[PDB]
């Protein structure tokens, strides 16, 4: 595998505004109508989160400072997963979360991630809903321990919060329909945990995995026609702050302050 695409496209970064977003349940204890104050890693309100586009193939190795907030508009399922790690190379144990069509596979291996990792996606003519995914993520995967498979994590805005504390990798999500044209919605929505993986590795950088179609084939290029659908994903950073987290009568977080 390991085909590299991004020759020279170096358009300067663009920042949108995560109005009031990336607020999760920092507890597994049900709370009735009460304003609760929590001190944990939250995405600050009205913070400039980067605005990446899938159509420039935008697979940059981004820092995992203290935990990231990941949100993707993604009208069609193209944002497929992540490659959290410290070096994203051998000699360093790394994490991989990807979901194919009906299940997510989470692996923590000594990956040899490609320079431009992604997935090729094809629709076989026998069933135009098959979406056969080919892995162009890593060249070698060996000498590892963890493996987790469950239902898939994923214009259908989809928000995530990955934070790596004391050996547990914690994932939160809230997949909600979106009609807004370009940027994050203004309404408040509280992410709720997906899994709590006993990973226990060192994570400092991370990179997203796109699902690119092979539109055309020049004979020898391998980098010819990898069109990238149309989507945009939004990477913010968690910081240690103290929210006052309001719970509904039904136990849901309907509003918060910073």
């Amino acid at each position: 595998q390991c085909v590299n695409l991004t020759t020279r496209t170096q358009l300067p970064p663009a920042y949108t505004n995560s109005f009031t977003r990336g607020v999760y349940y920092p507890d597994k204890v049900f709370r009735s109508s009460v304003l609760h104050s929590t001190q944990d890693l939250f995405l600050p309100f009205f913070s400039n989160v980067t605005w990446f586009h899938a159509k420039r193939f935008d697979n940059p190795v981004l820092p995992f400072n203290d935990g990231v907030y990941f949100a993707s508009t993604e009208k069609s399922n193209i944002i497929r997963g992540w490659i959290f790690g410290t070096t994203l190379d051998s000699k360093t144990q790394s994490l991989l979360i990807v979901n194919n069509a009906t299940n997510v596979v989470i692996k923590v291996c000594e990956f040899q991630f490609c320079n431009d990792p992604f997935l090729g996606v094809y629709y076989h003519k026998n069933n135009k809903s098959w979406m056969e995914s080919e892995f162009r993520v890593y060249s070698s995967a060996n000498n590892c321990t963890f493996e987790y498979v469950s239902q898939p994590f994923l214009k259908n805005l989809r928000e995530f919060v990955f934070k790596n504390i004391d050996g547990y990798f914690k994932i939160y999500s809230k997949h909600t329909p979106i009609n807004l044209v370009r940027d994050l919605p203004q309404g408040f929505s509280a992410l709720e945990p997906l899994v709590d993986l006993p990973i226990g590795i060192n994570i400092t950088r991370f990179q997203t995995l796109l699902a690119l179609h092979r539109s055309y084939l020049t004979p020898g290029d391998s980098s010819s026609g990898w069109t990238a659908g149309a989507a945009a994903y939004y990477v913010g950073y968690l910081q240690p702050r103290t929210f006052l987290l309001k719970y509904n009568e039904n136990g849901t977080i309907t509003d918060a302050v910073d």
Partner: antibody
Framework: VQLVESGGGLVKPGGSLRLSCAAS????????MNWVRQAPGKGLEWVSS????????YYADSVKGRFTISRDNAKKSLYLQMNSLRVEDTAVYYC??????????????????WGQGTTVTVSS | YELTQPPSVSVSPGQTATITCSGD??????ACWYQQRPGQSPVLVIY???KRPSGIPERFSGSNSGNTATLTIGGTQAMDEAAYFC?????????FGGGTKLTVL
């Protein structure tokens, strides 16, 4: 990329050969590699295939158990061992890129890049 | 798995040629096509039953339906005199058609 074959030469039946197909560029790591042979006066015939990382290996029935394929992306090379050769294996052996990285994708591309094949004559 | 092709086809230059490839329910598979000039390496001219690689002229049109996938050469001329091999992948093992020579008068 460009492929150059080597290692094909005259041999008596039952011999052994190690075909080598060294790619021009290092993007050889991204192509599933295919061995296809053209009999001296007959049509084109598939022989073997290997995934891009080498984890998926498939052979034709007429060579299963006798040939073993491998690839070394570090040396950007493809290899074919011919164990227990027979006379009906004389051909010119092409190495052809596929483009799909795994066997589930081989059907979605074609053998787009072909190295100039090397002739293998298995006779007395 | 087996694919059948006519031994040869012949058309006048500038006409339309048609090389056919019949197989056991081939229309559910992707049939790629190759071109082999006499004594040269094959060149992929059609893949995925309709799509051409870059550099292959737009007059190379093919299709797949049912049990038969056909390749049609629009404006057949002198450089199209070569062997054409239908190809399909069954059980992760590729199969090549017989190879129908095309003669350009």
């Amino acid at each position: 990329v460009q492929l150059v074959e080597s290692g094909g030469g005259l041999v008596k039946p039952g011999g052994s050969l190690r075909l080598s197909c060294a790619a021009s560029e290092f993007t050889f790591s991204s192509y599933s590699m295919n061995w296809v042979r053209q009999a001296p006066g007959k049509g084109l015939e598939w022989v073997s295939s290997i995934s891009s990382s080498g984890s998926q290996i498939y052979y034709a029935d007429s060579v299963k158990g006798r040939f073993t394929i491998s690839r070394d992306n570090a040396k950007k090379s493809l290899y074919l061992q011919m164990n227990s050769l027979r006379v009906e294996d004389t051909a010119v052996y092409y190495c052809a890129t596929n483009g799909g990285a795994h066997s589930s994708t081989w059907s979605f591309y074609g053998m787009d890049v072909w190295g100039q094949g090397t002739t293998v004559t298995v006779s007395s | 798995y087996e694919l059948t092709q006519p031994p040869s086809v012949s058309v006048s230059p500038g006409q339309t040629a048609t090389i056919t490839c019949s197989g056991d329910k081939l229309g559910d598979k992707y049939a790629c096509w190759y071109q082999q000039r006499p004594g040269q390496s094959p060149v992929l001219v059609i893949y995925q039953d309709s799509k051409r690689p870059s550099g292959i002229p737009e007059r190379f049109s093919g299709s797949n339906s049912g049990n038969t996938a056909t390749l049609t050469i629009g404006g057949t001329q002198a450089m199209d005199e070569a062997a054409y091999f239908c190809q399909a992948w069954d059980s992760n093992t590729g199969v090549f058609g017989g190879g129908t020579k095309l003669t350009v008068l």
